[PDB]
Write a protein that binds this ligand. Structure first.
Ligand SMILES: Cc1ncc(C[n+]2csc(CCOP(=O)(O)OP(=O)(O)O)c2C)c(N)n1
Ligand SMILES: Cc1ncc(C[n+]2csc(CCOP(=O)(O)OP(=O)(O)O)c2C)c(N)n1
Ligand SMILES: [Ca+2]
Ligand SMILES: [Ca+2]
Ligand code: NA
Ligand code: NA
Lengths: 616, 616
């Protein structure tokens, strides 16, 4: 029920907006860096959202019943900090420690701050995360909390934003409000549309949003705009001036990310303070408590894998099966896929648990941001899937997911040349490089159905950015159903006493190495075959012990480019160990179409390459 | 001047459309994979563009005067192949070799085909490349060629597409036509908007395009729609049915990427052939020849760098200077930046050569695709810039740029923790991993102004995906102006006879290593300091020779994560060389805000870390 504010409450919201301006200035001048002009356009929005519109516990920002706020334009972090001091949560003196190594008031928001769920310094990402939170609130939590996301106008140039706009209308997120700070300017020039407010409205409405144009420096218009619920996602299109309230700087270029020098900070602050009618702060209003409790326990498969050694299944299929199976053990599991469900086999999970499958369409960036938003406050355990090749489309979302300390799971299918005829646009050959460079990642590369099921289970229970690399060829099951698997533990899958070299393969190259072993025993050459299971962390101890047993010789073979994959991880793990050598076989250039087996041979990673190389 | 077609010409265009259907079916049934239904919705579009609308030389697809065609929905490649056989360029029998290892008719289009400029299997990328070609045609070539881009409807879910739509209207590309194959279905379900043609029109018009709704199976409507030029980019929004002309399969789900079995191919083909009135083919019409000639020669700086050893300059500034300097040696140089020109210093080039600077706004994906399109047919030599961190936003464009065999240059600033206070959202710590995994890449990491200028020059003249990693701290010039630099050649920058370890640093860590050397000489410990210059290719010979002179010991130190960077490249280069050890210092987790020097120490890659580590 909207509380229509009185003059006094209005004046108090303007005072708050002006305190927020002063604090953004003081903090950024104290730091000697930061973005006070990007704070100042948003001052009334922030005052009205925090001190009229939103409902939350000011002493418990993470509380699951709270309305959510996402500062998509993350460089306005000082004003986010200022509202949490205004609300009583942060000590006001701490605001001056902005950007110090002794402070958690960092340059852009990050989840070490209790009041931040997702990191947003890379622009255009916050609305997708907000859609994750709103989808969760409407469809999973089924709670009364709302979700507010504040975007810049330059920021609306990112296509990820429009993926999120489209998602919100497809999924009728009428508990989501995007506020667009139309302050006319980006970093280095005006934003393309400047103050053509009608064209912003037309773009938003075309994408299915209820779009209201407001004076973004009118606390009353903002109250009223935020005050009416809709049956659609709502876009509050706020006409503002960058550096609003800073005389001489308002509506000027050349001021993005430039702090006021001390002397100018003092003079400006004094003018702003002269506008403030009372020192007295507005109190936050707490939320209706209707979010459900969510069970934190380990999630276990309801049975062991039911594959038999010798049956043939592609690991992309085993993943679909395993994920559906795991869906029956826990209600927190959700799946997301970008119009590839029939190829990744996440369609299996959709069939069994339709209410927990989210079709994300051809929009990999948004898919990862939705998963990040679903995983905030630990509300769900998301598994996203597409071809591994197209996770490169989402690399900045993935990179920011680690800075957001996010626990999301990603399964990318169709890795390497062994997909065959589609050709290199669909071949993931850089995904091990990409995910290894993500600092909280665990990289699972299961070589058969059993290993795949076990990887799914382990990933579910593993913090950080979990990636699972699946494959298209239907290889044999080689592991017993009851084989134990752990993160960082490899498997020796063929061995003797008289082994000439330890061959390390994974997925299709593991089975190529076992086939090479068969060619090689014909000439009385034994090879140890090792399946790493995780590429990160790598089982160094096992790899070294195997190498010492095989006259120091390691051969790595991978359906991936040479850089940042299995061969380099292994090289980096063993370099400088006496008596250890490492030969690396990998894919040396952009591939082409052909049969899976023909490509494996053309690119020097099939049984014959492996066999030919061991002899050397 | 529009040639209004007669009935006979119309009937001939329908016959062509039906031949194109048959060939797409025969080719994909012969291959046993491919997407005949995705071909069949587009058959009339393709017939009308190739045999009425476009002007090109049928025997010279790369000819610089030709209209350009971009198949953004690249999985429809068999019908692209079919039109080039229909035009006389390809032998008709070759179409049956679709997807064979003995054929260049690969699963998706790739530039080994004379008729393909850019690879487009990753959806949503072709319109940005097309904008590159149209911007070049309108503003650089100043030619009469037009650019036509065919997109799927599921494909319009990619935000990159909307970045391109916005770019085309900002830059008034009235020589660009996007054709939207609205066949209602994506891969695994209907496309979100299905056949709500009005909402597609509203979205296109909101983004500044002239939008015409047509029956996509009406050759006459298509002729007419393509026949009128506009003052805006034009979107032909074509209502079609997926699998059009395949009885029983038209407008059905469960058929994306599924070939017709032989028996069904034969029956369908016979029905389609029964609709064809004459065997006689339409001839292509050649273009007005008004594209200018473009000089192919090496590009040399007009003077040597004018830095003095001991002056301090950040390499991000040296890059702006060098690029502007290089702009004066050659007219082919163009620069592109995503609203970061004041931080990357590409604003220097904009100042001196405004007509050759393209502001791409906050839209990194599109920026890379525009550069790819500008570089097609070798019309320009593009240099794109942004913070290196935000090149992760464009990784799939970069990856596809290598599959497109594209010669583009990318300079990413603000690498590592040494940027200081903004915090990790802006810190590139995975960019060496990312660009090393691109198979045609050269990775330049210049450590001072002179090396930066030389890298710019070399990159300009180097094929493939050239990346230049620039930095924020203002370090000393350490190289003489006349120092020679080459791809793959490193530099020993401090040495003696009595050196304990070869320390390898780059950018800020090179200068940290030289400062460590100063701390270490105090205790009579000499260290060899080596500056790799290129990370890929790496100067293995020099690194090994240096290590043998320093008792086998290598220490690598880098402002980058441990995976896929300098330390792993060096490890992979030296592993198994007798007497060689490698200690690696890198950044071990997501960073945080602080001063540049404080972060370098917190993360164990500053002078004291290096000094402390050598002693071990
Ligand atoms: C993905 C990405 N690209 C580029 C940047 C560099 N950058 C930071 S803020 C900014 C300008 C943002 O302008 P706008 O969205 O209008 O916000 P304002 O400060 O005007 O409110 C840019 C280009 C970034 N942070 N993220
Ligand atoms: C970036 C990216 N993500 C996912 C895919 C997987 N894929 C290939 S075709 C396709 C469906 C494309 O549907 P649409 O754009 O409507 O084209 P249509 O075949 O119907 O003409 C998908 C999801 C891809 N090729 N590229
Ligand atoms: Ca702005
Ligand atoms: Ca479609
Ligand atoms: Na996990
Ligand atoms: Na180059």
């Amino acid at each position: 029920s909207y509380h229509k504010p009185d003059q006094q409450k209005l004046q108090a919201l303007k005072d708050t907006a002006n305190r927020l301006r002063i604090s953004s200035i003081q903090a950024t001048t104290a730091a000697g860096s930061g973005h006070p002009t990007s704070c100042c356009s948003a001052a009334e929005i922030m005052a009205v959202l925090f001190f009229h519109t939103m409902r939350y516990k000011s002493q418990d920002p993470r509380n699951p019943h709270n309305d959510r706020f996402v500062l998509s334009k993350g460089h306005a972090a000082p004003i986010l900090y200022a509202v949490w001091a205004e609300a009583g949560f942060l000590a006001e003196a701490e605001l001056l420690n902005l950007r110090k190594i002794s402070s958690d008031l960092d340059g852009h928001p990050v989840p070490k701050q209790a009041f931040t769920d997702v990191a947003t310094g890379s622009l255009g990402q916050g609305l997708g995360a907000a859609c994750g939170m709103a989808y969760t609130g409407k469809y999973f939590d089924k709670a009364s909390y709302r979700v507010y996301c504040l975007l810049g106008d330059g920021e609306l140039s990112e296509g990820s934003v429009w993926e999120a706009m489209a998602f919100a209308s497809i999924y009728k997120l009428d508990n989501l409000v995007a506020i667009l700070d139309i302050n006319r300017l980006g970093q280095s020039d005006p934003a393309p549309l400047q103050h053509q407010m009608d064209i912003y409205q037309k773009r938003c409405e075309a994408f299915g949003w209820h779009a209201i144009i407001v004076d973004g420096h009118s606390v009353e218009e903002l109250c009223k705009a935020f005050g009416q619920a809709k049956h659609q996602p709502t876009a509050i299109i706020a006409k503002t001036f960058k550096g609003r309230g800073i005389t001489g700087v308002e509506d000027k270029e050349s001021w993005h990310g430039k702090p006021l020098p001390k002397n100018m900070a003092e003079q400006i602050i004094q003018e702003i303070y002269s506008q403030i009618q009372s020192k007295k702060k507005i109190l936050a209003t707490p939320p209706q408590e209707d979010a459900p409790s969510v069970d934190i326990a380990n999630i276990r498969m309801p049975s062991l894998p039911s594959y038999k050694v010798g049956d043939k299944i592609a690991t992309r299929k085993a993943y679909g099966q395993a994920l559906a199976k795991l869906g029956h053990a826990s209600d927190r599991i959700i799946a997301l896929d970008g119009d590839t469900k029939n190829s990744t086999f996440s369609e299996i999970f959709k069939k069994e648990h339709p209410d927990r499958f989210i079709e994300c369409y051809i929009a990999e960036q948004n898919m990862v941001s939705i998963a990040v938003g679903c995983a905030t406050r630990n509300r769900t355990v998301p598994f996203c899937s597409t071809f591994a090749a197209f996770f490169t489309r989402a690399f900045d979302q993935i990179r920011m997911a680690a800075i957001s300390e996010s626990n999301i799971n990603l399964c990318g299918s169709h890795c390497g040349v062994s997909i065959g005829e589609d050709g290199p646009s669909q071949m993931a050959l850089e995904d091990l490089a990409m995910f290894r460079s993500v600092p909280t990642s665990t990289v699972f590369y299961p070589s058969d159905g059993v290993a795949t099921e076990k990887a799914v289970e382990l990933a579910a229970n593993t913090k950080g950015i979990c990636f699972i690399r699946t494959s298209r060829p239907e290889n044999a099951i080689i592991y017993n159903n009851n084989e134990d698997f752990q993160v960082g533990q490899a498997k020796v899958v063929l061995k003797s006493k008289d082994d000439q070299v330890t061959v390390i393969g994974a997925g299709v190259t593991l089975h190529e190495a076992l086939a090479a072993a068969e060619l090689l025993k014909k000439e009385k050459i034994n090879i140890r075959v090792l399946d790493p299971f995780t590429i990160k962390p790598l089982d160094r101890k096992l790899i070294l012990d195997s190498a010492r047993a095989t006259k120091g010789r390691i051969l790595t073979v991978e359906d991936h480019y040479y850089e940042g994959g299995i061969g380099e991880a292994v090289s980096s793990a063993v370099v400088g160990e006496p008596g250890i050598t490492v030969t690396h076989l990998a894919v040396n250039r952009v591939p082409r179409s052909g049969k899976p087996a023909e490509l494996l041979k053309m690119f020097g990673i099939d049984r014959d390459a492996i066999a030919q190389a061991v002899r050397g």
